[model samples]
Target: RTRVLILGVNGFIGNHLTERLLREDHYEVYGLDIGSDAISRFLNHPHFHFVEGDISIHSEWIEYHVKKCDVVLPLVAIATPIEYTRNPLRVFELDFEENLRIIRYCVKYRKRIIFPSTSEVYGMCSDKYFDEDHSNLIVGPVNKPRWIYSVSKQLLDRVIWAYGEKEGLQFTLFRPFNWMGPRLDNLNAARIGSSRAITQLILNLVEGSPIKLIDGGKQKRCFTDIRDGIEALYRIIENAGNRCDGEIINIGNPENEASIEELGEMLLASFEKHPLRHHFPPFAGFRVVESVEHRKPSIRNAHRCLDWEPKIDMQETIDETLDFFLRTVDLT
Candidate 1:
């Protein structure tokens, strides 16, 4: 049996990926996190082991797991726009310092690793879809402040690629497009993307009620279902060990992109059983920082290399997210 280890498993992506691995019974999973409610849920599962600590801090727990694991997937780092802005310096340091720790640990142990890169690295690209070959990004003036997160991640991406190339690190760096599902954390608390919110409103909105759209709602983004992300990871791991190593591919649906207005409409349409409507508010202030009206994925390389395409389309992603939000909601 292959031994699998995950770093920062309390995260939204970490929890979902851990669930997928456990569901299939494919590998024995050892999850390490800073220790939160999300990570604690799986601690009692027979096939799952949990190590709780900061990966950058050099804990006994992380060292113990690294020595024994075969594959390491790092899903740490603050990803939300609001959080990134709230603590931009920490955001940069956490990824830069912690990710270096992860890479060094993996290299030392001779472990194959999968590092998830974000689409934020595109950093205000000129094109509609960013391809694997398109790494040229606009590094804005240091005072601009808007590009901090992407610039930080882009720097980390280059470091990962360079380390992998020069040190014979067996790894694949994956760039995933915006993925949304039942665990968007802070966004849920604000009642936006309520499925991820896990609140009474999630149930209240089953019949469709007023949702808080932050703007006149014209911004556009592509959303990949969390299920699709998990599936892509499985495919990548299954195809591991040779040509796919040290490669970077985008995992998302190239065709099913939608504007925020269209997505809101799709969410409303998803609640067909009980009719609902929309409620758009004025823009949420400049500091809130929504992605400028662009940045979709060019998934051609993913299809060619991994023989995988997003199996779930956008409309279905909306429906499934709505369904899960409605069914599993438990607010105290």
Candidate 2:
């Protein structure tokens, strides 16, 4: 059986992938993360092993897990825009330096690496749909802190490509447009700084607070379901050397594209229809916010290469995510 080790396995994407792998019972899954609460349920699985440790610091245990695994997925990242603006240096250290360490090790050991990159690397580009090889990445000036996250991730993508070409490393890069689902970090007193647009809107609905949109909420995104993305990722890992090696792939559903304003309205509508809302009231309404143009992905590569496309639509994704939050909102 193939053995896989995931860095930051407790994160939303990592944890989801781990659960899916365990359910398939096709591989022995190992995970490393600084925090373990999100994965408490999986700690008891016979095929699962977890180490509570930071990827930023080297450890013998982490190395041992990496050495034993067939593939290494380094997913530890500062994903939220607020985190980048709050601590740009820490963002760089975690997003770039820590992954650099893993990349170097994977190169030395000749292990296959599947890195989870962000769509933010596209920046405020003019393209309606970004392709893997032929898209001009338009990033903001260095002075703007918000661009730090994108810059750091773009540099890491280049670094991985460089290593793949120069040192003969086997690698595949994933640029996810907006994969949202359960276990996403919502705005709370403890994690108020890590809120995303959807989570923020959900929280406002739960608390009866006004949903605030930034810059008229004109920004558009293609929100792919987490499960669809995970299935595609597993397919890539299973067929690594055949057609996916040394390629940067976009993992998103272009058909589900919607503006932030439309997204807020949809969530509010979902909440209104949900049965659980009878027990707890939802927000009366939402406000306009956000910027940027349509930043979607061209999925021709995904279909041409991986024979994969998203199975879930936007409305279904939102329905599932909203139901999950309704049941678990009290816990967080």
* Model 2 residue 61 CA deviation in Å: 3.2
Ten-residue stretch with the least lDDT total in model 2: 186-195
Candidate 1: tens digits of C-alpha lDDT, residues 140-231: 78887767877877777788778788887888778876666775544422111112322222333543344444465566677778788768
TM-score list, all predictions: 0.82, 0.92
lDDT tens string, model 2, 1-332? 78888887775766788888887868888887777788789889999888777776765666777788989988777776677888888888878887788888888888889987778888887887887889898877778779988888899999999999999999889887777788875332112112266777787888788777677776687788888887888887787446888888999889987877788889989999998887666576656544458778988878866899899988999999889888886633
Best by TM-score: 2
Clashes of each: 1, 6
Off by over 4 Å in 2: 186-195, 281-284, 289-291
lDDT for each candidate structure: 0.67, 0.79
Clashing pairs in 1: 188-197
